[PDB]
């Protein structure tokens, strides 16, 4: 199945979807009539092939001269998030689901673009320094201007946790120069190991009913959860608890036996981790209605994640903020103020109980589940929409 969760990052109206299309052919759709013209809310999904010519996009070597057929390397799946500074929660969720990143910078649009920088920062925070950098709108720029842009980018990427991350000049519309990108996908991104015995944990980003308009109820379908595994091969025929729960104010975890564990385009026996998977469960498709299973944790039955509202956070912050042009000073965190705490996939609205030296105690208005220590990206409301302040770990 899908071997490595590779994410796509860039500015809004630059062409992440376009890039995906160029790579795979699989469309992110762009939907709900708002997003048909403009920008997606959900993650965009695509399945790209790597079968190398060693003597590729398709498993045949008729194209690159030598008739010695395309030698199977990998199959990779995309994690394409919204690159808008309003919808950052989704991006954050994607980030602690990904194994590696793909940057997208346009030629004619500037080098210190705010959103892109923010994305980069997020990636750095959440252990995602494996970034393949792509020059995108180069089918517009001069023989000198492009070079200048590249130089500027290089200059920028000197103090960042990205040091010598590779840059490729592609056209997402004209279909050129993606060979290099493909090569890098095997070269610069090795897949981090993901075993059998590391306790099975599924991180849900999407809720899906496949209940088509027109059918009869004597021919029914269950609930499908679109979520990623980063530990534990889920096999067909297992019982599950989804632990952030269902709301009564108290919450109670949801129990579902596996109908299917579906990856690629064809349903499989297994779901080997480091991939984003559509899990058919006996759970109602009415709870998989639109975007209900977003930021929920799934464990195999006989397991104890903990649903915390009162949290011990170890926090770290910036000197100067991101999301804006206008990079504003980080004023100190203020008590009993609504922050957004992004933990793996959750985007919970939290109130500050205490501020110490490097630790903070937080109240959650919506309960999140901590199994391990859990990776956090933090966010705040200063300029209406949510800006990225810093990062944390749950000290548990």
């Amino acid at each position: 199945q899908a071997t490595i969760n590779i994410g796509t990052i860039g500015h809004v109206a630059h062409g992440k979807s376009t890039v995906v299309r160029a790579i795979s052919g699989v469309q992110t759709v762009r939907f709900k009539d708002e997003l048909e013209r403009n920008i997606t809310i959900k993650l965009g999904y695509a399945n790209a092939k790597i079968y190398k010519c060693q003597e590729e996009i398709s498993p045949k070597c008729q194209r690159p001269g030598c008739p010695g057929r395309y030698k199977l390397v990998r199959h990779v799946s995309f994690v394409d998030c919204p690159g808008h500074d309003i919808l950052m929660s989704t991006m954050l969720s994607g980030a602690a689901v990904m194994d590696a990143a793909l940057l997208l910078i346009a030629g004619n649009e500037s080098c210190p673009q705010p959103q892109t920088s923010e994305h980069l920062a997020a990636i750095e925070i959440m252990k995602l320094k494996h970034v393949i950098i792509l020059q995108n709108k180069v089918d517009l720029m001069r023989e000198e201007s492009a070079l200048e842009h590249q130089k500027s980018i290089l200059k920028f990427i000197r103090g960042t946790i990205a040091d010598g991350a590779p840059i490729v000049p592609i056209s997402a519309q004209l279909k050129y120069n993606i060979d290099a990108v493909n090569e890098f996908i095997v070269k610069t991104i090795p897949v981090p190991p993901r075993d059998f015995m590391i306790s099975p944990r599924l991180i849900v980003i999407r809720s899906f009913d496949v209940n088509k308009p027109g059918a009869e109820i004597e021919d029914l379908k269950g609930g499908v959860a679109g979520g990623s595994i980063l530990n534990g091969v889920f096999k067909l025929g297992d019982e599950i608890e989804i632990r952030p729960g269902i709301v009564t104010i108290q919450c109670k975890p949801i129990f579902s036996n596996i109908v299917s564990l579906f990856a690629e385009q064809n349903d499989l026996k297994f779901a080997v981790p480091g991939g984003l998977i559509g899990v058919g469960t006996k759970v109602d498709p009415t709870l998989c209605r639109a975007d209900r299973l977003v930021g929920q944790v799934v464990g195999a039955k006989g397991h104890l994640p903990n649903i915390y509202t009162d949290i011990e956070i170890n926090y770290f912050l910036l000197r100067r903020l991101l999301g804006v042009k206008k990079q504003a000073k980080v004023r100190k965190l203020e008590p009993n103020e609504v922050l957004m705490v992004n933990i793996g996939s959750t985007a919970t609205g939290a109130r500050v109980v205490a501020v110490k030296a490097d630790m903070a105690r937080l109240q959650l208005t919506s309960p999140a589940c901590t199994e391990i220590n859990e990776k956090i990206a933090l966010s705040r409301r200063i300029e209406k929409h949510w800006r990225l302040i810093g990062w944390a770990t749950i000290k548990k």
């Binding site: 088509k212 308009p213 059918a215 029914l220 129990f255 579902s256 109602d284």
Partner: protein
């Protein structure tokens, strides 16, 4: 072409219960017309109306509208025949008018079979009358027989065959429900299936996982009052035993 004879006599022979409507009264009584032979007309005298001298303000309310009567006397060649509605029992309202209503509904079928087929009405009427309304009672109860007793369609020749098709098209209502299955469970699918397996066996359509459009057929329009309600009750029953939540519009 519009209307014609019923039973092959020019006049409603002595002592047969008929129906008329009163058109106007000036001094004689009403200038009625015999509703079985519509274009022909008889009349009634004032003492053969209601016995209490009917006032002119009592007189005006009854014109145009119809009632039931019997015929006193018949001119063999004049149309000027004497009516009787005063000396008529109340059972003839049940007897004649429903029999006439059973002959009003064959006027509804023999109009588009005649003029929308562009033939005069009496010729495809008088192919029907003698083997149907003289062999036994008149043919509308036999028209609910001839849809299953096809010795009548072959018992007479069809001069046209459009009329054989236009009969069973005519002689042979949805209550919308947007029930909202707002479930949050694990055994909900089964419940839904169970619900389907009793409410559909009337027209049930899936819209999504929560919304369902079911258009329950009613016969008297008020007989689907006992159907929709029943369905609702079933729905209520269903979801308490499985784990989810169903809400009804």
């Amino acid at each position: 072409t519009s209307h014609c004879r019923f039973y092959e006599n020019k006049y409603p022979e002595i002592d047969d219960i008929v129906m008329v409507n009163v058109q106007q009264i000036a001094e004689m009584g009403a200038y009625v017309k015999l509703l079985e032979y519509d274009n022909i007309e008889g009349m009634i005298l004032l003492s053969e109306l209601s016995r209490r001298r009917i006032r002119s303000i009592q007189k005006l309310i009854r014109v145009g509208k119809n009632d039931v009567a019997v015929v006193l006397r018949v001119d063999k060649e004049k149309g000027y025949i004497d009516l009787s509605k005063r000396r008529v029992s109340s059972e003839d309202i049940i007897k004649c008018e429903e029999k006439y209503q059973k002959s009003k509904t064959v006027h509804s079928i023999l109009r588009y079979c005649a003029e929308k087929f562009q033939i005069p009405l009496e010729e495809l009427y008088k192919t029907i009358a003698w083997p149907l309304s003289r062999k036994f009672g008149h043919a509308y109860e036999a028209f609910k027989l001839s849809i299953i007793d096809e010795t009548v369609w072959e018992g007479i020749e069809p001069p046209s065959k459009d009329v054989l098709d236009e009969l069973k098209n005519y002689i042979s209502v949805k209550i919308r429900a947007d029930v909202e299955v707002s479930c949050f469970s694990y055994e909900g699918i089964d419940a839904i299936k169970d619900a389907l397996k009793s409410a559909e066996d009337v027209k049930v359509k899936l819209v999504a996982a929560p919304l369902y459009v079911l258009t329950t057929q009613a016969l008297d329009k008020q007989k689907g009052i006992e159907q929709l309600e029943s369905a609702i009750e079933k729905i209520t029953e269903v979801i308490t035993k499985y784990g989810g939540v169903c809400n009804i519009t």
